[PDB]
Amino acid sequence: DDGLCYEGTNCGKVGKYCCSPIGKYCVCYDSKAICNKNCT
C-alpha cells in the first residue's frame, strides 16, 4: 500500500497531482498529499 507521486495532468488531475508506480493506478487528488496518502 505505497508508491510515489508526480505533478501535472496525466491522470486528469489538472491543478492537483497524480500517483501511479507504472501509470496503472493513475489516481489523482487535490491534496498532493492525498496523492501519496489517499493514493496508497
Short mmCIF file of N, CA and C in Angstrom, two decimals:
data_model
loop_
_atom_site.label_atom_id
_atom_site.label_comp_id
_atom_site.label_asym_id
_atom_site.label_seq_id
_atom_site.Cartn_x
_atom_site.Cartn_y
_atom_site.Cartn_z
N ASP A 1 0.85 -1.22 0.00
CA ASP A 1 0.00 0.00 0.00
C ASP A 1 0.88 1.26 0.00
N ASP A 2 1.65 1.45 -1.03
CA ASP A 2 2.53 2.65 -1.09
C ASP A 2 2.87 2.99 -2.54
N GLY A 3 3.68 3.99 -2.76
CA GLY A 3 4.05 4.36 -4.16
C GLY A 3 4.70 5.75 -4.19
N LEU A 4 4.70 6.39 -5.33
CA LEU A 4 5.32 7.74 -5.45
C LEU A 4 4.32 8.72 -6.07
N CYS A 5 4.68 9.96 -6.27
CA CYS A 5 3.70 10.92 -6.88
C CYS A 5 4.40 11.86 -7.87
N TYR A 6 3.66 12.33 -8.83
CA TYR A 6 4.24 13.26 -9.85
C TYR A 6 3.25 14.41 -10.04
N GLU A 7 3.65 15.49 -10.66
CA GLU A 7 2.69 16.61 -10.79
C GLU A 7 2.46 16.96 -12.26
N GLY A 8 1.25 17.33 -12.58
CA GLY A 8 0.93 17.71 -13.98
C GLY A 8 -0.55 17.47 -14.28
N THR A 9 -0.85 16.65 -15.26
CA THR A 9 -2.27 16.40 -15.62
C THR A 9 -2.43 15.03 -16.32
N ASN A 10 -1.54 14.09 -16.10
CA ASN A 10 -1.66 12.78 -16.82
C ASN A 10 -2.78 11.90 -16.28
N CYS A 11 -3.37 12.29 -15.21
CA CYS A 11 -4.50 11.48 -14.66
C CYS A 11 -5.70 12.36 -14.51
N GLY A 12 -5.75 13.38 -15.29
CA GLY A 12 -6.91 14.28 -15.22
C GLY A 12 -6.81 15.15 -13.97
N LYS A 13 -5.68 15.12 -13.32
CA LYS A 13 -5.52 15.93 -12.09
C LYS A 13 -5.00 17.30 -12.45
N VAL A 14 -5.73 17.96 -13.28
CA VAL A 14 -5.35 19.34 -13.71
C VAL A 14 -5.45 20.27 -12.50
N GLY A 15 -4.34 20.76 -12.00
CA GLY A 15 -4.41 21.67 -10.81
C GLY A 15 -4.04 20.87 -9.55
N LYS A 16 -4.26 19.58 -9.54
CA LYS A 16 -3.88 18.77 -8.34
C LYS A 16 -2.67 17.88 -8.70
N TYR A 17 -2.68 16.60 -8.39
CA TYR A 17 -1.49 15.77 -8.74
C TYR A 17 -1.93 14.31 -9.00
N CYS A 18 -1.03 13.42 -9.39
CA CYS A 18 -1.47 12.01 -9.65
C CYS A 18 -0.46 11.02 -9.07
N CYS A 19 -0.87 9.81 -8.85
CA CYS A 19 0.04 8.80 -8.26
C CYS A 19 -0.10 7.43 -8.97
N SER A 20 0.99 6.93 -9.53
CA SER A 20 0.97 5.59 -10.21
C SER A 20 2.42 5.14 -10.43
N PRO A 21 2.76 4.02 -9.85
CA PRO A 21 4.14 3.50 -9.98
C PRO A 21 4.35 2.85 -11.35
N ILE A 22 3.39 2.97 -12.21
CA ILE A 22 3.52 2.38 -13.58
C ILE A 22 2.46 2.95 -14.50
N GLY A 23 1.81 3.94 -14.03
CA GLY A 23 0.72 4.59 -14.82
C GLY A 23 -0.49 3.66 -14.80
N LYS A 24 -0.44 2.65 -13.98
CA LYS A 24 -1.57 1.69 -13.90
C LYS A 24 -2.65 2.20 -12.94
N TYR A 25 -2.27 2.86 -11.89
CA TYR A 25 -3.28 3.38 -10.92
C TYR A 25 -3.81 4.75 -11.37
N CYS A 26 -2.97 5.56 -11.95
CA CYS A 26 -3.43 6.91 -12.40
C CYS A 26 -4.52 7.41 -11.45
N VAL A 27 -4.19 7.59 -10.20
CA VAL A 27 -5.20 8.09 -9.22
C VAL A 27 -4.77 9.47 -8.74
N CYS A 28 -5.57 10.48 -8.98
CA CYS A 28 -5.14 11.84 -8.58
C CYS A 28 -6.05 12.44 -7.51
N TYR A 29 -5.56 13.46 -6.86
CA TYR A 29 -6.34 14.14 -5.79
C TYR A 29 -5.96 15.61 -5.75
N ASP A 30 -6.67 16.41 -5.01
CA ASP A 30 -6.30 17.84 -4.93
C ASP A 30 -5.14 18.03 -3.94
N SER A 31 -5.18 17.35 -2.83
CA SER A 31 -4.05 17.47 -1.85
C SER A 31 -2.88 16.62 -2.35
N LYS A 32 -1.89 17.18 -3.00
CA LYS A 32 -0.79 16.29 -3.49
C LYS A 32 -0.59 15.24 -2.40
N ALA A 33 -0.70 15.66 -1.17
CA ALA A 33 -0.60 14.71 -0.06
C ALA A 33 -1.66 13.64 -0.28
N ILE A 34 -2.87 14.00 -0.63
CA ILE A 34 -3.88 12.96 -0.86
C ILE A 34 -3.36 12.00 -1.90
N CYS A 35 -2.47 12.49 -2.69
CA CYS A 35 -1.83 11.62 -3.72
C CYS A 35 -1.09 10.52 -2.97
N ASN A 36 0.01 10.87 -2.36
CA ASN A 36 0.77 9.85 -1.56
C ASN A 36 -0.15 9.18 -0.51
N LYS A 37 -0.80 9.98 0.29
CA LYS A 37 -1.70 9.47 1.36
C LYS A 37 -2.84 8.61 0.83
N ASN A 38 -3.86 9.24 0.34
CA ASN A 38 -5.02 8.50 -0.19
C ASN A 38 -4.59 7.62 -1.33
N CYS A 39 -3.68 8.10 -2.11
CA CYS A 39 -3.20 7.28 -3.26
C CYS A 39 -2.80 5.89 -2.78
N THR A 40 -2.37 5.77 -1.56
CA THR A 40 -1.95 4.43 -1.04
C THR A 40 -3.19 3.59 -0.71
#
